[PDB]
Design a protein around this ligand. Structure first.
Ligand code: ADP
Lengths: 8, 332, 155, 375, 52, 26
């Protein structure tokens, strides 16, 4: 989930 | 790829226009500030005759893109930034009467909630919207013109509210010249401009030549007179006023307001009781039971006091007995 | 949709991709069986009450058999699913263990009377959570908004 | 004031052979023989009920053209000495008369016609009540909601809170039909009810509707005491002992009469036209709230004491409670290993998660229904 | 006679007689009625505070 | 309505199940 964690 | 590229051209040109008027915006605000003022309107080649805010006069020019033809008097807008020449127009900024209506905010919008008066509204609607919205049967019936209504009644019960309500069912206007505090004959011009108007009066004797002077003063101009203006005078007593008003017919209509009886007071106390919460059942008659000489107000007062007597116990429903101690309180 | 016409992992995303283009298209053939067939497959994976019956009055396209088998699994017994199957028999789409799967999701309690009855690390039972359990569902809507950007690239 | 109990009659006749003809038939044709009204009462009998005979229908349409014809020359008479209050009231001849025609054009296109040439809010929400109240008769939910947002325009002096409560009764009577049982009870509960001699309230119904709409959504500790020890409703259900013994058979745990009391409600579910998933869902949530009230106080529930709740024995509780935990809306489980039901409580921290999966999905789906090319 | 000259006090006393045994046919009606007739006289704090 | 109900399968409700419940017990 650090890889998993597009918004910009 | 070229079509998508020209979409990117639209994005880049849009952001580049943003930075255009931001850059020349920061050099732009180093210029001047236009003034503002009402005028008396132009006569001649360009022309204005302004009166600016601090010191009220000048005559200035008008730019090509202003079309000096519509800019009418008492419609403030200016721009003579430095050399004194117009640019454009602004919010009309409420003309004169808008002032003495909102200012004397006394007139409170009223419509049809009159507490049990039907002969009275039949007679005032007989002589306040028939001479406005159907003049055709008056110019074929042989009648000359009905104008001027005198509302005599006790203090309360029909004043400032019947002449308000049938002024605004008709959407006429409602000019009140009650009082002369801050500013006759100039008011007629405003009324004429409104085209149709209604002028209302004052009633003070108790709750030498007070306002019968202006009364006739506008019946002298009104008799020979741009025609659908109707003066209204409210007084407490018909006998107290002038013998000059005793000149049939100077007052084409003498409507009479009685003090309210049982059922009309259950009607007005029905409406003012329709302002608030009550309970599952009141049966309002017992309050009207002691109505005996009451007054219009004497009803709004006791309904607000019944509301406060329900408010004192932090209670959210106006019970029966708060009326009974309201009307049993106000007997003073 | 024609690609929708085995596996069940993506039949619902091709159901979202399928149920798009029919304002008023046909009355047999193309417009009809896409909706009802795909929601039947959406019960072939096992999705029960709360998208089924109030979504029916939009189509109402002859509407007997497939809805009857949906409540025949929503109840979940072979006794009247038999007469859904054999007494109808012409419903087609021929291509049992799933309505078995519904009732045994309960158990009697858990084990069921020393491993034997019939009906017919997060010590909690699976309620919610603040770790890996709910994280999966969380990153669902985030993904959705990210996929919904596409909106900004359309003017 | 269209339309009265004739709404309930129009339900009961079109209701199947649970109820057909025979003396709901004459009170219907007491209005149909009354009010002389062709344009609905042939569309009424069209629904599997009755055909020509035209025996009532001729002077029905003839008096329809009598009153409909004679009202027009007040619309053409109201110019001699008759202001817009009389063109107004001529449109009230056309409006009340062509509102008791029961047409959704004869009333509907007259009310926006009288929304023009219109005096203040002795009218603007007089008709939008009078349009809402027949929208209840025709259940056209868009007409109801557009009359709500047209009826939240009461900022007159509109703080007329014996007219908010008319609208509050209308919101309660509508929101009971659209599953929103949260908004219904309180609105009803905190209203008292009075509307022009309670003619749409049609009391012998209202306080009953409150005290069997409450225990769905009005929370069993909180304002259920405001139901019980609230001295506004208890004296008027005193004359209504059936819903009374329906009321004090929850908090007094006398449940051998409570299921009896709820079987009464499933026989007077027949009446109200807000009907079918309201009574099936209603008996479902009375049922589930009744079981969840019992076993929540205990960490272990025996078979004999749960059988003591009525006397139903075993399989009623077994199949039924297994259906409820199949829905997963209680926390119990049929632990037949000992025949003693266990109950702890995982709290409502998970409630949200499970709630919002579906919720979230639906919300995005709506946007997924829009945010494509079709915009 | 003149309304509630002393029947504020007598009405207070009979309002004390009911609450020994009785119910709402007095409770709010005669007491509040005594208060409605109790805001229209010279009230000493004996009678007005006893009515309080 | 428009909040999804079951209304599926189940035979006549708590009136009749009440009736055969108390009759089956007695
Ligand atoms: N018939 C009535 N209907 C409604 N309000 C009335 C009536 N009679 C008196 N009033 C009250 O009188 C007030 C208006 O004052 P007004 O009657 O113009 O004073 P006056 O009595 O000096 O003419 C309003 O607040 C209104 O509630």
């Amino acid at each position: 989930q650090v890889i998993e964690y597009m918004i910009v | 790829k070229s079509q998508n590229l020209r979409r990117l051209q639209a994005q880049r040109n849009e952001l580049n226009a943003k930075v255009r008027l931001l850059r020349e915006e920061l050099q732009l605000l180093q210029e001047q500030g236009s003034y503002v003022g009402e005028v008396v309107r132009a006569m001649d080649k360009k022309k204005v005759l302004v009166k600016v805010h601090p010191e009220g006069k000048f005559v200035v020019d008008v730019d090509k893109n202003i079309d000096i033809n519509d800019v009418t008097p008492n419609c403030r807008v200016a721009l003579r930034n430095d050399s004194y020449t117009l640019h454009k127009i602004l919010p009309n900024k409420v003309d004169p009467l808008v002032s003495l209506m909102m200012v004397e905010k006394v007139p409170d919008s009223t419509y049809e909630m009159i507490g049990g008066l039907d002969k009275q509204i039949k007679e005032i609607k007989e002589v306040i919207e028939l001479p406005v919205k159907h003049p055709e049967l008056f110019e074929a019936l042989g009648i000359a013109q009905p104008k001027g209504v005198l509302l005599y009644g006790p203090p309360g019960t029909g004043k400032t509210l019947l002449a308000r309500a049938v002024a605004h069912h008709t959407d006429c206007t409602f000019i009140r010249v009650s009082g002369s505090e801050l500013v006759v004959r100039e008011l007629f011009v405003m009324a004429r401009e409104h085209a149709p108007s209604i002028i209302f009066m004052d009633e003070i004797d108790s709750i030498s030549g007070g306002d019968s002077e202006v009364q006739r003063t506008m019946l002298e101009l009104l008799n020979q007179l741009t025609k659908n203006i109707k003066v209204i005078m409210a007084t407490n007593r018909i006998d107290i006023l002038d013998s000059a008003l005793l000149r049939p017919g100077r007052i084409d209509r003498k409507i009479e307001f009685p003090p309210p009886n049982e059922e009309a007071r259950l009607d007005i106390l029905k409406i003012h009781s329709r302002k608030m919460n009550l309970t599952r059942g009141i049966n309002l008659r017992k309050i009207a039971e002691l109505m005996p000489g009451a007054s219009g107000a004497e009803v709004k007062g006791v309904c607000t006091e019944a509301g406060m007597y329900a408010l004192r116990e932090r209670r959210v429903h106006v019970t029966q007995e708060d009326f009974e101690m309201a009307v049993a309180k106000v007997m003073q | 949709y024609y690609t929708g016409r085995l596996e069940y992992s993506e039949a619902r995303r091709t159901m979202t991709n399928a149920l798009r283009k029919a304002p008023q298209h046909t009355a047999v053939g193309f417009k009809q069986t896409v909706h009802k067939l795909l929601i039947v497959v959406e019960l072939l994976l096992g999705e029960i009450p709360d998208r089924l019956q109030f979504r029916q009055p939009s189509l109402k396209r002859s509407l007997m058999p497939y809805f009857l088998l949906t409540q025949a699994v929503r109840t979940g017994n072979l006794a009247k699913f038999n007469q859904v199957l054999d007494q109808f028999g012409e419903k087609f789409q021929a291509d049992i263990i799933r309505l078995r799967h519904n009732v045994i999701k309960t158990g009697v309690r858990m084990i069921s009377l020393s491993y034997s009855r019939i009906s017919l690390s997060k010590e909690m039972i699976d309620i919610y959570s603040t770790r890996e359990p709910q994280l999966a569902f969380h990153q669902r809507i985030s993904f959705c908004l990210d996929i919904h950007n596409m909106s900004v690239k359309a003017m | 004031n269209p339309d009265l109990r004739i709404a309930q009659l129009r339900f009961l006749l079109s209701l199947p052979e649970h109820r057909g003809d025979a003396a709901v038939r004459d009170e219907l044709m007491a209005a149909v023989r009354d009010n002389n009204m062709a344009p609905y009462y042939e569309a009424l009998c069209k629904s599997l009920d009755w055909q020509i005979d035209v025996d009532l229908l001729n002077k029905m349409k003839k008096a329809n053209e009598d009153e409909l014809k004679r009202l027009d020359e007040e619309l053409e008479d109201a110019e001699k000495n008759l202001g817009e209050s009389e063109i107004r009231d001529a449109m009230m001849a056309k409006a009340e008369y062509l509102c008791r025609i029961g047409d959704k054009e004869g009333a509907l296109t007259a009310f926006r016609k009288t929304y023009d040439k219109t005096v203040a809010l002795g009218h603007r929400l007089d008709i939008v009540f009078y349009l809402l109240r027949i929208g209840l008769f025709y259940m056209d939910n868009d007409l109801i909601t557009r009359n709500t947002e047209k009826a939240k325009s009461l900022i007159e002096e509109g703080g007329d809170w014996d007219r908010r409560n008319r609208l509050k009764v209308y919101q309660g009577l509508y929101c009971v039909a659209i599953r929103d049982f949260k908004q219904a009870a309180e609105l009803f509960l905190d209203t008292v009810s009075t509307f022009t001699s309670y003619e749409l309230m049609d009391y012998k119904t209202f306080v009953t509707y409150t005290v069997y709409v409450s225990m769905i959504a009005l929370e069993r500790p909180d304002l259920r005491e405001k139901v019980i020890k609230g001295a506004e409703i208890l004296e008027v259900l005193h004359s209504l002992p059936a819903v009374r013994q329906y009321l004090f058979s929850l908090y007094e745990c006398r449940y051998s009469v409570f299921f009896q009391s709820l079987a009464v409600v499933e026989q007077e579910m027949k009446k109200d036209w807000l009907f079918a998933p309201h009574y099936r869902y209603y008996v479902r949530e009375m049922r589930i709230h009744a079981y969840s009230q019992l076993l929540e106080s205990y960490r272990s529930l025996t078979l004999g004491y749960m059988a003591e709740a009525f006397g139903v024995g075993v399989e009623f509780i077994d199949q039924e409670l297994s259906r409820f935990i199949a829905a997963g809306r209680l926390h119990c489980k049929i632990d037949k290993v000992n025949e003693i039901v266990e109950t702890n409580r995982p709290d409502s921290k998970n409630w949200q998660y499970q709630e919002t999966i579906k919720k979230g999905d639906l919300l995005l789906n709506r946007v997924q229904k829009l945010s494509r090319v079709i915009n | 006679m003149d309304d509630k000259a002393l029947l504020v006090e007598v009405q207070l006393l009979e309002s004390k007689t009911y609450h020994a045994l009785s119910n709402l046919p007095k409770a709010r009606a005669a007491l509040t009625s005594a208060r409605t007739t109790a805001n229209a006289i010279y009230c000493p704090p004996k009678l007005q505070a006893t009515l309080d | 309505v428009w909040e999804d109900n079951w209304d599926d399968d189940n035979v006549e409700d708590d009136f009749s199940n009440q009736l055969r419940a108390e009759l089956e017990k007695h």
